UniProtKB/Swiss-Prot annotation:
Phosphorylated on tyrosine residues upon activation, e.g. upon integrin signaling. Isoform 2 is phosphorylated on serine or threonine residues, but apparently not on tyrosine residues. The C-terminal region is the site of focal adhesion targeting (FAT) sequence which mediates the localization of FAK1 to focal adhesions. It comes from Gallus gallus. Belongs to the protein kinase superfamily. Tyr protein kinase family. FAK subfamily. The chain holds residues 415 to 686 of 1053 of the full protein. ATP binds at I14, G15, E16, G17, Q18, F19, G20, K40, E86, L87, C88. This is Focal adhesion kinase 1. Residues 8-250 form the Protein kinase domain. It is found in: Cell junction, Focal adhesion; Cell membrane; Cytoplasm, Perinuclear region; Cytoplasm, Cell cortex. Interacts with ARHGAP26, GRB7, DCC, PIK3R1, PXN and SRC. Interacts with the ARP2/3 complex. Non-receptor protein-tyrosine kinase that plays an essential role in regulating cell migration, adhesion, spreading, reorganization of the actin cytoskeleton, formation and disassembly of focal adhesions and cell protrusions, cell cycle progression, cell proliferation and apoptosis. Required for early embryonic development, embryonic angiogenesis, normal cardiomyocyte migration and proliferation, and normal heart development. Regulates axon growth and neuronal cell migration, axon branching and synapse formation; required for normal development of the nervous system.
Length: 256
């Protein structure tokens, strides 16, 4: 997985990353003389603590092989440290949804939720807990293909109650977060709890308040969201059920 720096042509910045800017570029490889790639950079990689955290994402990514999880291409582990990844040419999901709010039909939004559930069911099958499921961590590879894109203060507005209260992350907590991610998609990439301080979030959850049904959201789908937000983690569905239900909802929507 170590790539020679001279084989990478760094191009335009395409986005911001948790550790630094993400660029597109070209990998001049023996396999392929001009492969389009994403290049993740890391400001302050000269610090061993930071670099270790950054490069851990690549190690994590390497373990996964799924149509809806972005692939690792390689790494450059001398300063400046880069992670070379598959390029998802349509960018971040939130931006994509806001820009295309009035081009994208309901069936597309539902397809994206389904595709993400297939990735999360795969992670669940490997007993991997993601801990940060949210629309900001999803990339768009084509108008009919999204990928889970990021496995790197606290995202309180996405977190399950038990996660906020007791810093507890489990497969059940991921499902709560997926519920919120589904809400985001159906809202065309609006953030949950806008205009609310991170500190008042838990108060409302405990009070039994949930994010409201998005406009034009099918009742079947909102009800699935609501199941994801059962306060008791043990009553939340698993991704196998979410995937199967999303598949049926997607089909019904296509029959419209």
């Amino acid at each position: 997985y170590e790539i020679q720096r001279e084989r990478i042509e760094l191009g335009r910045c395409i986005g911001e990353g948790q550790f630094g800017d993400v660029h597109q570029g070209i990998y001049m490889s023996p396999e392929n003389p001009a492969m389009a790639v994403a290049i993740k950079t890391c400001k302050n990689c000269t610090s061993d603590s930071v670099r270790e955290k950054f490069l851990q994402e690549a190690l994590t990514m390497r373990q996964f092989d799924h149509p809806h999880i972005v692939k690792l291409i390689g790494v450059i582990t001398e300063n400046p440290v880069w992670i070379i990844m598959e390029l998802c040419t349509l960018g971040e999901l939130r931006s994509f949804l806001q820009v295309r709010k009035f081009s994208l039909d309901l069936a597309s939004l539902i397809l994206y939720a389904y595709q993400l559930s297939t990735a999360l069911a795969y992670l669940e099958s490997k007993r991997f807990v993601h801990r940060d499921i949210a629309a900001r961590n999803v990339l768009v590879s084509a108008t009919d293909c999204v990928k889970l894109g990021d496995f790197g203060k606290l995202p309180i507005k996405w977190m399950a109650p038990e996660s906020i209260n007791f810093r507890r992350f489990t497969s059940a907590s991921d499902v709560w977060m997926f519920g919120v991610c589904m809400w985001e998609i159906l809202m065309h990439g609006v953030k949950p709890f806008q205009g609310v301080k991170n500190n008042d979030v838990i108060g409302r959850i405990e009070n039994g308040e949930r994010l409201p049904m998005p406009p034009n959201c099918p009742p079947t789908l909102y009800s699935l969201m609501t199941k994801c937000w059962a306060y008791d983690p043990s009553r939340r569905p698993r991704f196998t059920e979410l995937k199967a239900q999303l598949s049926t909802i997607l089909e019904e929507e296509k029959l419209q």
